[PDB]
Enzyme design. Sequence first.
Site, PDB file in Angstrom:
ATOM      1  N   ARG A 173     -12.528  28.816  29.224  1.00  0.00           N
ATOM      2  CA  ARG A 173     -12.561  27.679  30.134  1.00  0.00           C
ATOM      3  C   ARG A 173     -13.208  28.000  31.465  1.00  0.00           C
ATOM      4  NH1 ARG A 173      -7.045  24.708  31.269  1.00  0.00           N
ATOM      5  NH2 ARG A 173      -7.257  24.468  29.001  1.00  0.00           N
TER       6      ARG A 173
ATOM      7  N   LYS B   1      17.238  45.410  28.354  1.00  0.00           N
ATOM      8  CA  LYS B   1      16.638  45.057  27.068  1.00  0.00           C
ATOM      9  C   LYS B   1      17.652  45.294  25.951  1.00  0.00           C
ATOM     10  CE  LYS B   1      12.654  43.867  24.996  1.00  0.00           C
ATOM     11  NZ  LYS B   1      13.255  43.767  23.630  1.00  0.00           N
TER      12      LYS B   1
ATOM     13  N   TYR C 255      -8.068  30.609  28.410  1.00  0.00           N
ATOM     14  CA  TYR C 255      -8.334  30.597  29.831  1.00  0.00           C
ATOM     15  C   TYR C 255      -9.547  31.381  30.225  1.00  0.00           C
ATOM     16  CZ  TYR C 255      -3.779  28.666  29.352  1.00  0.00           C
ATOM     17  OH  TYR C 255      -2.779  27.845  28.907  1.00  0.00           O
TER      18      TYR C 255
END
Lengths: 496, 496, 496
Positions: A260, A121, A257
């Site tokens: 849905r 990182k 999501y």
Amino acid sequence: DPNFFKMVEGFFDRGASIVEDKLVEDLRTRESEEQKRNRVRGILRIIKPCNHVLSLSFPIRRDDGSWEVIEGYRAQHSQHRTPCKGGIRYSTDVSVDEVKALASLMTYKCAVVDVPFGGAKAGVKINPKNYTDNELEKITRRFTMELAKKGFIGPGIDVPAPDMSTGEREMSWIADTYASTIGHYDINAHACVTGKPISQGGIHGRISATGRGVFHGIENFINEASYMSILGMTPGFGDKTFVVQGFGNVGLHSMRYLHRFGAKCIAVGESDGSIWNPDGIDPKELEDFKLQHGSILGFPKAKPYEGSILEADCDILIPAASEKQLTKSNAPRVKAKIIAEGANGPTTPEADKIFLERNIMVIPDLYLNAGGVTVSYFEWLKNLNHVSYGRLTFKYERDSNYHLLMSVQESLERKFGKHGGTIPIVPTAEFQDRISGASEKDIVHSGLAYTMEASARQIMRTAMKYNLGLDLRTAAYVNAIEKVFKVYNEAGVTFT
Amino acid sequence: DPNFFKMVEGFFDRGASIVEDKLVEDLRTRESEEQKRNRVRGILRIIKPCNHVLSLSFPIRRDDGSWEVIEGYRAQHSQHRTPCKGGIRYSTDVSVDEVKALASLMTYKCAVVDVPFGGAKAGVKINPKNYTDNELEKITRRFTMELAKKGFIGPGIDVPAPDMSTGEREMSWIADTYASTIGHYDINAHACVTGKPISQGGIHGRISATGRGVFHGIENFINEASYMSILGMTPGFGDKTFVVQGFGNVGLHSMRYLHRFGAKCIAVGESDGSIWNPDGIDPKELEDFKLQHGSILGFPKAKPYEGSILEADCDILIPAASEKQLTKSNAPRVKAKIIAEGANGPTTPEADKIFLERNIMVIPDLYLNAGGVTVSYFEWLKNLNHVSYGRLTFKYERDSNYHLLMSVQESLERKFGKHGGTIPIVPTAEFQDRISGASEKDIVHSGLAYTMEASARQIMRTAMKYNLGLDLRTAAYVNAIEKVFKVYNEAGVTFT
Amino acid sequence: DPNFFKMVEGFFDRGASIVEDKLVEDLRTRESEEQKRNRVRGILRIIKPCNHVLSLSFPIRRDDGSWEVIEGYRAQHSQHRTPCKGGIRYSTDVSVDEVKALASLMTYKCAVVDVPFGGAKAGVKINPKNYTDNELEKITRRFTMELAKKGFIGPGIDVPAPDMSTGEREMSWIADTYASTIGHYDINAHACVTGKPISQGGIHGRISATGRGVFHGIENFINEASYMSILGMTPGFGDKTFVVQGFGNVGLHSMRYLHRFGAKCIAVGESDGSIWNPDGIDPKELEDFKLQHGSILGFPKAKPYEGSILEADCDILIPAASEKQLTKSNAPRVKAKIIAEGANGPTTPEADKIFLERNIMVIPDLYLNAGGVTVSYFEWLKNLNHVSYGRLTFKYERDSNYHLLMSVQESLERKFGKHGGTIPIVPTAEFQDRISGASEKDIVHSGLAYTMEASARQIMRTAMKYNLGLDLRTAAYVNAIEKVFKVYNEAGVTFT
């Protein structure tokens, strides 16, 4: 509240010991030579400590002609897996321990969703806001160059990525800089960083990756009997209701999501106020509201809820923003049965303890948001493959499906002298859509769902293996730690 | 008592400012466009910060079969001059800030003695005393491997050297490892580090380099009227009397050369007691006495002096050991008119102020012990030349010198009908020795002398330039800063 | 008036055909197998055509945010000698032929003064006037960048240099872009281009190089009886009196050195008017006039002369400016007896014909100004050596001279009992200057004077070998052609 360094470090140490005992005995202590098998656990030691970290103080000429020197860091936790993978943060609060820690996280995260990278990182102590676009390009490149020269960016060495403070713009620039400079002779140069624009070698299905990942994580657990029982879940009247803190990239899609698929989005909360509606918020609408203007605030079809949403009554609460939000403070006041970390470190080690006690299942960040790592792996691959997924199979696959159908027809039409009667050749409207829409994302998404799934079951098998309850988080780290350890074990050190 | 970090930072700042005004105007302001000539000073802000710094954590398998992870650092201050040059210290008190500072020092030291290297330095948080020889070879190689992969060692990148805690042994090992591994294909691989054995591509005249450096440093200032007046020196009864603090490599030789030329070494200290004798101490004798058993304590022909030899009455005082000895606590009590820093940072900034008030000339460390860092350049060059200095020319040279002498002879004999009468041909006994000694050292030593000499005059010319008195120290750092700045200026940044 | 392309092609054929005959027979046709010796002269047809030419089209972002594509070309005439050497021109009339031709010229010029380089040359169609400094930097680094990706700049490949339109700035940028980019890993990266600033790795003695070179050229022929007779030179009243056309860098120093050695500079003309003064113009004074302000027009101690100074009555006339000045138009009206081409192509082939008929000796540009090229070699060398000339020997050398003188003294003082009587030891004042002033330029100038010399002889020996007269030009080209041929001949092609 503690800081990720101590936290993550805790996480590693808790697991680490749990693994020792077992890791010694039954798994390899079949050949206990000198019973110094305990001594070989030195691997762990080696593992724990971010391996390399590079600090740099490079210059740029700010648009006004002046000269500023910018500091930055990039750490590489492990290289037990050739390319290191990690994001690049641009914030004036970045600190060598920050990176060192997250880069640690990264390696263990990758391991979980079996991605072959070492964790790394970086941070560039800079506030993107205080610099003109041009200046930001200048910085990202010069940063890239330095990074290259010292071995902190390379397709086979270290592949960066974005991070809230940074997006596909930075990343394209990186890519480009490398490719035109240090990497001009590398047929895979553009695979030096992920998160690039599609026109620049980015993989489709990237944006929604992190979120879709969160979806599946919850899904693989919410569909699992055993667990849902211990909570009382997979309910009739309770069914599916969730609260999502943070409508950023990951929260948003994470709501999309979850919706849905038959879930009610009770409440959504930002940095400003919050929203509520027991009937349910519609993602599209809330998404187009948030976008069209400023924030969600005042959303028509949503009564401004007050009181941390973290204490709203729902089944699944997904922390998708600010760090350590659920602490020992409100931990004993959360309603949700399931906490799904769609962000990094949204809950403190003491809160974890409260939750455990009061049987709240926490789906760890380590896992739950590994979707964007996962898909990067894919971008990486696609950049080596030097081709977009599906390109050379779609149509072949189509042809082969039809024959399959045609064979069922013709065959069935041999059981009744016909020649147009039985028609199976017609694919379901859904199937037909899929056929005519065949594009990269489909394969990515599919890959993502295959990993999240496998991994979930791996965690689960480990929680049992080491008798942890809904302590997914520690089963996860243990999982990654058993992994990283093997690779070392099956080699050595320099006697590796 | 500060710390090199602040001290050296101070120094840089002090001189930086001094350079800013002058640097701008008459040197380049001729064309002062936008008068933003004060903005292009940014170069100085780029210079000050140690550019790259790499921290490691690598393991080794201790002889007992256990596993330990060692930490270490290596920082490269500047690359304004391709191969960074710097030592490697093995001590439990090493610290990022230390290396970041000593590095810094390096660059400026080199730029004084016109040595084309950026400064760098490293440290391996270890105590060479708690490890076997074998375990030290393992630490030094791994350490080299990791430095190599990241861009910290490399004939044309960074070339390390020893530091008290480390010697040739470690260096040879470094060299080897490099040349066998990462540097297998490099025809100059062995050039990756200096301070190597002779058998391993070392140069001759290394051991006596630092000392002989101090010497000539003192020499060029002691023979300069101007200066030795403002001190009331280059005296008849005072002549030359010195006291040296520390009988390590650098102190010893320092005494040896100071002597051989007509000085009296009154006192000699150590980490134990001290020595005294107003009639002088013989270098060969004390040497043998410090070698043939423990320390110089109880030296026969010396009376155990007591009371900080720094006070001692003598012309020149050469601190050759511990850091910051002469502080604002005994600085007013010194008796020597010349301080000759044959160690790094022996005198505190405050002490510099006191000396400067009571007209005590201090010969900087940045300059007076830059001898090693000169001869190391030479080693490196020897390693590139793939030959020993002299090898091809000595005998050619002798031949030529006898032809010269022979022409004088024959020529004179044509002024008196003779054939064996006048005999110039005969070289002086001194010349004869030189002619039958001719070796590499003879070239190194000479090179050292040339540099020290030209640099002294450079320092001097600068003091004058910026009207400093016997404030060499900041004349020096200016000198350096000017140098560095110039390279940068005649290029840019990435618009360089 | 023709065009270099045709001219320099004519030069190559004319000589090529003279080389043939001879080159066949005696020299190698000792072993005339199949008398196909003639056929192996294919070498000469391989030689004549500029091997590689690279045309570019790259963009830069002008200061005013707009975008403009620039077009440049770099040609490499030969690689029979690894690094191709050659300047970069920035002028809106630069064409592919113009580089193809001058690159040719390079290889043959380098041969002449035995420099191991293949000819090269590049142009960037551009007017350095219609661009800000910042824009110029951007153009020279992109340019480089490109050149470096396609094999047109590399220390062991191709090494550019300046050319009137460009200077040390451009170079230093090139150097730098190349070392921080494609050449990051090259210990010699800063050797990629010569003409750099001393702070950048330039060499001392560069500025004066070209001129000194002219001087020595003229010198070696002036001092040669044979030639100076055919002109009725090396006079008594005539002695030495020259007229220099052009007071740029070459023309100026030319005048400096021609003067320091006895000559009288009668006239000096520029792109404005001209000077005149039978008594002579002093170099330092006219060089301080030109500098202090605009031109040299109205120089006190000089009457304004009018009527092309080419026709001035003097011995030596040196055209150090504009191309093709002496043409078949004025050729018949020249008064000088020696034409010294300090510039490239100052005389047209038809003028050469007139001069040849009237017995005027023209020292060819291919040779007279090969001084810069010489020194550049030295700069490139310096860069590989990674050290400044003299750095390790000057003092050694001093120390030796003194023993030489102290040996004459001691020895002479044995022929008369005395210890201070005779005093050779004392160098001459001149010797003493030299001693104190020993610096790179000393060694460089000496190298230049050795080469210019050899070569002059070499050319001479060849004009005799091939029975030319005062047609030094052709003798030169022939001399180069014989050289290049040999290097090909001693190998083959790919069967080389």
